[PDB]
Symmetry: D2
Subunit: 477 residues, 4 copies
């Protein structure tokens, strides 16, 4: 157990650990779901990235030596390559600025950088957390910068590929079943013929719309608060520091993608720029809430996909039984041989959690107080949870449900034959009023449209077979 | 055409015929926000009129105003809540967050009407002062929350609960009518084991009875009124006993009103008004109303499953489940002739989403307390009263236009009982879960029935099977 | 009382009224908040516009005579110019497709058009609601078309001008007070100097971001379902009807703007195009929910504006008292001469109602069932309520609060003089650790930074006056 | 390294050391969704272990299984809820919506452990079958909702209520310590009339007591368990009396557990488990849990005003209200040295927004019932248990790290009492509202005090004013 000190006095940390007084204090002061609600590591990794480019920029502006800059840079890289995950024990439910996690990163980099320079660990640190590692920075501007950076990388590199994968797997089935005629249902009542491919193209469209909205929003969250310092004025920040750091951060993220993902083109290039208004970048998270809204819309689209796949696979004998979903596992502890649409149920629960995350972000975004919104850790945790949910859940559904989707061709054709709303094609011939008489007749006396149309002397058996052709109704031009 | 009126800020015009004064003319101009559709609910105005009546009587009995004045205020009050002045209240929800301008809107109408009743003529010199007489011993801070609780208590007790009890009672008819009709339960929308249509209907009855019981339990908690707290809850400029006497008189007034409105009828709950134990909490928060909002939120979630289940079970007529036949109340389509839709289900489902949204809005408003006063009061009142009318009208609509004349497709239902392979569930205590699984897998992958599969596999004889496989006995295994 | 008939039998309507059987039935069948929850007239007006261009397009494709087309067209115009508001009594809480309001418009146009042709009103109508007025249309495609059209016009012509007006009034005060130095507050604690203009520029930025998002979303909601008919296949719709109707609707909306608003350029041109995927346009409202999200973000920005104006006008003696808001009315029934920030309280309640409207739309958007989302009237009513709230509330706040905003210059300057976090400029001189000692001293012995800095022999009285200059701290470059 | 396991679908590998079986190996691979952080809460797993214990005992006493088998299941059960197998439960929340895979995850661990306890060695032939023995007379459909209600009942009774009572008790200390310190109330953030700091603190105590009382009242309603309903609520393949005997044994088990955990302690509520009156509603909906979610939502809204009010009142130290001095638990800033922030307020406020969001999520899940089974169960459980831990930890954190050592800036508070012009409110019954308004307008627009303005205007003599203007008497006008 090492001993460290600050303004408030003396406190213990484990001797193995790189974090210091401020981390020790936050550990004890914020004992709220410490087991499960750790600040997301994506925030810690992005803070490490920002401190690296801050070190390089501070050296280029002649504000710090190259001995210090170099040791910090090597410390930063160890953190975002995941060699110090256990140096970050602080929870989401800390200070609303994320100051304590910023100090946590400052203290771990400070002490490690100090170890690399010295060669041993001493009580007197060569690298100061405030004077060196945090130089030209507040938590007020650097925490929002880490929020936007971490969420831009999650969204561009993890979320978009997953959504594109699900779109691509639906497109395979869309084409595979484009010529399979089924009956449309509106208000869950029998409607007119359409193809299975047409129905799948509806989900592809909704998900493509979602992907297009997210791609458009990304460049706007790549506007960074960095350089605003305490209240947005940029006091204690060098002229050009915001612009130079955003250039370096663009190049570091460009290199990082290409180390992580070989022979791939990013779906969107991440070009970081200083925010046009640093006051708005501290006082609000409008651009992150707009992305939250894009994820909310994505969730509502994914909800219909799940619910429609559950409805169309209902059965096997007392339901619709149009769709056959792959059977991945036994369904029931009590009902032997029952197989449930469990990939649909997983996605639907994930979607409700994304929508709830969006309502939480909305309320948190609305709680601005003068110069600083102090719900930042909650906005970060909810958007980063949504990124992981969309990433993992859409890929699960694509691979464990859509990939091996099959049809019950006999049941589907039974529905095409039996829908009374085939009569719809006859309304331009025999009129809307006489078509209703026809359907009312077919229902009462439990007979088909053809037999009924002859029986009421309204259409000849020859004319009926000429007018009513299912596949031509699904594609009428 | 106009009447020059005067406030502490100065003079302004109102139409000659109106009884509303200067602060109403000001509010009207200052808050031009959805003025066509977002008028402060009249239930708040009527409840304020009822409070002003007993407030006058209580102030007279505590020797703070005259019988001449007190008698005049009472008669004007009665004209307002009998609905003889509905055009004297044009202010919107989106006013001051204390509802002060609606309080002063009622103060002015009663001020000037009571003044015309005494003098027998309308002179610009008012005999009854809206602040000194009509608003005597009151703040907007305590009276507007008192009118919120009073308005919502009467809506909830007298309109919402009778509507919910009516829907439960019509569901109970059908529950009894179909208690012995065996259908197949569905879990995960997959075929499961037998149950009765009545057992399935008992599920919605139970959820709706839980909702009624939660609402009946919450009502006496919202009958705790802020009255007597005045500006910040200290009771400054309110005489001792005023709150306790006003609550007794209000209890008696609401008791009389119910028996005027509803003949040969026992109220589902007696509204007994009492002062809140903590007047500071009664001004600074709306916890008791937000708890009632929660009860309505849970009711909406129960009604949502009733809607979605009736839509699902009535799907068809030829390409769906087709267990339920809903009354056909209209033709149904503009292009697909003879198509009838479950429109009563769709109406109720949209209403339930609006109630849940109303609950989310009320939750957010209740969270925005600042020191001594929550200033989102009109928004909380508007959302809660809108939910009361939606619950009242929609549950009765669904009861009378869907459930009352619900019929079954008994042919389709019996088809499902014969074909469900999960009837195998009953064989698990004889051959085990493992060998029961092997059996239904054979029945499924050889398009074969359960009995043929258990013989061909040799798991149970055809006589032993006939013993353990009775659908009516499976729904009521006792 | 006239008598009319349909499939379900015979029913009464008032003899004065133009609506018929389907409207009569919906009146009786959906007795839910009939006093207050009427289907919004903006939906009825947009349905009238669509039926007009449908009549013209049906004639150009040779599918209806010019006698009928012409009478319908004149009927349509009477409705959207507001000469038949009382012919539409149906509520939001009807069928989830809006079929009944579509029939209501069909019946009123049918009967009026029939009156203009005949010259008198007869039981036998010349103009059929289904065969003529609804020709080539379902409620499944025409109700979503009326939703997008009505909300595009509300947003482009009413919402955007109101938001632009509020931005323009904040910009006047932003410039007027750009050189007035005040103290920033973070976590509601004393921070560093900034100008009042800088603080106002934060709200201008957030509202400009909101306006830019809404302008970008409008062209996407101008993609219309029209021509999808029952399930999206376009059965019983003529080839080119969707494309020709969208051309005519673009030109009608262009003319309508210019009759409504003289010597003005629309903020956005409304160019209607057929939706690329008619299935998605029936099964979902993703584009309307994306606009809902833009309105949600706008509400969170307007929330901080309101709450900040309430906080900074707190007083007059026991609060911050930086801002003097115009006194529009007496504040209290009991506390004489008290004046409350009632324009802030109105806007804050409006914003909570917009966010609640967005949560309701989100849940309604998520409830898709196979080919048709049947929560359409609820989505329309909530977005159109939000349009009216944003339109009227932002203009109220702009004109009744921001326009005549004044400052308490003496109180503001007292705060600049007294904030101990002026010490922030000294940390690059005397260090972060020695600056903290300075502030701790100034607090304990209730003395100023200057007197304290000398007393601790840390900075000379001359050097201190040189380093600490408020106006230079707000604009450090 | 691995153990070949077998299900009705086929064979698969698990690590040699693990007690989990085939359906756990399958679920793990099939639902790779936030596997690092969204593990099914262990409270659900422990409650399932407790139910399996009494289920074994009840099945033995009803003559449906052996004492050899029953005794073995009990010992494995105890190892699970004592926390000796936490790494045997790797499945996520985002599994099947019935929680079947977590039910089978517990069935398998108990199956194989009980099998090793009897045989004294782990053979691939299991003496205890997870379906036939451990899951005897049970469905996931009735047992997972039983574990939901049991897990949330114990969290709520034993952790949440003691945390809320602790915060009320620390607020009551300060309420008493400052009952006679006069401050100025603020309505609309404008200066209002005198009140005591203790009166203001009594507002949060009242709101938090209302929350505790609503939660205590809801707890016996969630102790109504789905157990006995099996597949669809009919009780098919459950023996008569099993539910009633299991609930008696569970009551006794939870009673023993409390007294093992907490010494010299009376539970705030006794958990008395009973079968639900309607098993169909107990499977198809979670109305009772959503009502408790509502109670937590209202608690969050009350805690939000406590947070925002403490942040507001502690604003400064030189350019804010500066009435409250919050304990300084840390240095506070990275660039502004000596700046201490109200971090305990910010923590609690973020927690309250998360609880409200959790309530919105739970509301939406509760609305998505389809026929016989709500299949959003893990999501409802996860949200409610997360809210229980947040309420438990955050209210205690705020109590101990903020309220306990709350002090006042008595100088600043007394400045506000002297300067508030709304002290004029007390003069309204003497000179009237109109002439009281004219007075304060003169005092404001001539930078003059109230007494000087009433003399210079001639409204009340300097001696009569000294009679009617006492701040301590204004806060307690009796």
């Amino acid at each position: 157990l090492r001993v460290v000190e600050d303004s408030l006095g003396k406190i213990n940390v484990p001797l193995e650990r790189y974090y210091g007084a401020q981390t020790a204090r936050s550990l004890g002061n914020f004992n709220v779901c410490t087991r499960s609600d750790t600040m997301p590591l994506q925030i810690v990794y992005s803070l490490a990235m920002i401190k690296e480019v801050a070190a390089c920029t501070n050296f280029k502006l002649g504000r710090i030596s190259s001995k210090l800059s170099d040791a910090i840079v090597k410390a930063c890289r160890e953190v975002y390559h995941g060699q110090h995950d256990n140096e970050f024990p602080l929870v989401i439910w800390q200070t609303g600025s994320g100051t304590q996690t910023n100090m946590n990163v400052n203290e771990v980099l400070s002490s490690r950088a100090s170890e690399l320079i010295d060669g041993s660990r001493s009580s007197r640190l060569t690298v100061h957390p405030n004077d060196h590692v945090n130089l030209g920075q507040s938590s007020n501007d650097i925490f929002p910068t880490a929020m936007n950076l971490s969420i831009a990388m999650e969204t561009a590199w993890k979320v978009l590929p997953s959504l594109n994968h699900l779109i691509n797997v639906l497109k395979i089935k869309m084409h595979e079943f484009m010529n399979v005629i089924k009956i449309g249902r509106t208000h869950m009542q029998d409607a007119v013929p359409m193809s299975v491919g047409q129905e799948l193209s509806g989900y592809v469209s909704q998900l493509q719309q979602a992907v297009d909205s997210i791609k458009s929003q990304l460049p706007l969250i790549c506007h960074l608060a960095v350089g605003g310092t305490a209240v947005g004025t940029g006091l204690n920040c060098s002229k050009g520091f915001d612009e130079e750091l955003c250039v370096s951060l663009t190049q570091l993220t460009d290199r990082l993608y290409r180390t992580m993902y070989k022979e791939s083109t990013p779906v969107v290039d991440l070009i970081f720029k200083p925010a046009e208004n640093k006051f708005a970048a501290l006082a609000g998270h409008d651009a992150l809430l707009q992305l939250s809204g894009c994820f909310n819309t994505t969730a509502t689209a994914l909800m219909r996909l799940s619910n429609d796949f559950c409805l169309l696979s209902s059965g096997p004998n007392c339901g619709l039984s149009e769709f056959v979903l792959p059977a991945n596992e036994p369904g029931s502890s009590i009902m032997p041989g029952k197989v449930n649409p469990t990939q649909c149920e997983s996605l639907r629960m994930v979607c409700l959690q994304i929508m709830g995350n969006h309502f939480t972000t909305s309320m948190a975004a609305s709680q601005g107080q003068l110069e600083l919104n102090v719900c930042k850790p909650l906005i970060a945790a909810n958007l980063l949870h949504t990124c992981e949910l969309l990433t993992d859940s859409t890929r699960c559904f694509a691979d464990k449900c859509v990939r091996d989707l099959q049809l019950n061709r006999e049941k589907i054709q039974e529905y095409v034959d039996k829908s009374l709303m085939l009569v719809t094609v006859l309304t331009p011939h025999i009129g809307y009023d006489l078509s209703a008489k026809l359907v009312q007749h077919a229902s009462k006396f439990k007979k088909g449209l053809r037999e009924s149309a002859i029986e009421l002397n309204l259409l000849c058996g020859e004319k009926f077979d000429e007018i009513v052709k299912p596949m031509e109704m699904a594609f009428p031009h």
